[model samples]
Target: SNNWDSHYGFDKAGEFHMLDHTGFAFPSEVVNGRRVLKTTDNNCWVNVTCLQLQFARFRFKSAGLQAMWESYCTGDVAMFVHWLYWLTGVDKGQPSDSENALNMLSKYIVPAGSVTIERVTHDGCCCSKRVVTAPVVNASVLKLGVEDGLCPHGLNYIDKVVVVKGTTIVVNVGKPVVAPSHLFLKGVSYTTFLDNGNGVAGHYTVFDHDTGMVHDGDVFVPGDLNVSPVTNVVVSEQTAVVIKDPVK
Candidate 1:
């Protein structure tokens, strides 16, 4: 996404000069002098708030992503709690119906990506269509959207890696990406786990921190990330293992 017309994305982030792009979404229009598709809840939030969400999530995901660069840094897993609260309109001790709405939280979120978890039923007539209330599974589970392309966690393309240490999966980040499409540390905002409820309708909020997602942050090639990482899907050998953040 950071190419031809995306020359100045990072430069405009969080600045007043940035443009509001709602047209990319489902914008309603007039039909035969009548408005079609009334807007119930503005989907504009997705177009506008995704960046903030990503930035917020970086706190946790960046720990490992940046470890080699700075040697030491802190990750805020708690920020995710705030994000969920803000998105669902739920807060601690608040007397609101939304309390039940936030049945659980993902142990990790693949920063800057979208996800959907649900339950399936055996109705014989093509049962199991419940994404709203799904049971949680233990261990690490990576999600790949075979049914949708609008959202990708950015992990599906990890065809190879040169090296890995502690929490970082090292790769070539900025040297003229020979192939392309491999992402580095700072790019992904967070990682997550499914919350299987101890015993409740929305019983999958308690995330499993063992694997699947990484809040420990990651590492990547620095600068010109807009160049589109090597996408042909060939990984090189491991480079540096120490936490020096060479890419940064």
Candidate 2:
């Protein structure tokens, strides 16, 4: 926009401070450990929470319009999860690194509808991108929003990572099970695949060990799972629920 380089940004004369300038720099200075910066408009300053989101947007400048959503942002998991899925869709190698960005966005989010941050960068020659008017949601009131229901575990974007819970999951046999979305089951809080009349039973709840889908006998358990390195999309070894030996 101005001589403000997209790669390089500005300095925070004090504790506050974004085009990120694209490569001019991350745009801003670190104050007491948190990143603080400004937007296309130097007059408006943002704190750590906002800067982290801009980091993704700035990276988008390098990624081109294929980046999907412009600089727009939100705290809602509905949109957040989609944004993340698409973000990693652009760069397979960036997913792991993007986790940090998720934490930055989710850290302050404790409730379901506590925050919604959007950034509108100048599309032409004279518009300034910035955030304002919204009242700060209290830290204590913001809840994690993790819900419980049915079996066949699904995916939930917890604070720092996406996870699966419940008793049911998409199975493919001998491979990692796929979650509802683009994520895979990295770790299970606790799960029990009951045989019941269908003939499948196993309790794969080991808190510490990462596992793969395994069928030693009647037991259906989780084992080592991996995703495609190219898109980082999780390819599960198991999706259908079937027991090795049906006792029924």
Candidate 3:
């Protein structure tokens, strides 16, 4: 609490922050009909986008008044805390109170008078705030489809931008959208694979505003996919690319 007014301190430790962590999930891939999960973040075969957040518990003396203000939050922070109830899974295997990273926050609600708020350090790693990877406990999802328009705003992450065999994600934003990671253009679906990669027979198409449906061109390859035969069209900030699979 002494650092409350220190240089680079939380001028008011009761604000909300969407920590820019946990946005990407552990990469996964399918080979020989088996799905594979990688142990580390690098060289991940298929990295996808994930909703990331960090939660913390602080013990402060009754004099600490931020507890009352911080306890009452609105906007995404409120929405996030509300979503925490369903986050019953952990990034690491198994679950326990000490060994368990699953329980980001407890659902128990004690008497309001017992609450207190302490300082929180949002500084990236090497701080004193609690952080965890929150995964859904028992998710019941639905399948919804739209005819055509711009690809979802954040689908630019390749592993997260899957398209089904027959469906096409039209990026009609006039300017090129992007695919920023490894991509698979096949029919089969992974449980985590949403609208990001379900297309089949290689018919999955990305109709570029400038290039139409054609895949091979100087601008489309030597990078993301391949020449002669194109499977997907993804653009970087500068150019469009369609590099092919390097292996069988």
Q: What's the TM-score of every candidate structure?
A: 0.19, 0.18, 0.14
Candidate No. with top TM-score:
1
Scored by lDDT, the top model is 2
Which stretches in model 2 have alpha-carbon errors above 4 Å?
Answer: 1-14, 18-96, 113-248
- Stretches of model 1 off by over 4 angstroms after superposition: 1-80, 93-199, 205-248
From the highest lDDT down, the ranking of the candidates is 2, 1, 3
Off by over 4 Å in 3: 1-47, 50-88, 94-248
Candidates sorted by TM-score, descending order? 1, 2, 3
Which model is ahead, 1 or 3, in terms of TM-score? 1
lDDT of 1 by residue, 1-248 (tens): 32322321222223312333222223333322211222223322221122222222222223322321121112222232233334355443232221122122222222222213322222322212211111111111212111221213222222122221212211122222321212332223221112225752211111111221211112111222233222111111223542334655
lDDT of each: 0.23, 0.24, 0.22
Residues 32-75 of candidate 2 have per-residue lDDT tens digits of 22233332222111122232233222222222222222322321
User: Candidate 3 lDDT, tens digit per residue, 53-140?
Assistant: 1111221122222342133221112222222312332233221121111222222211111111111222322212122112211111
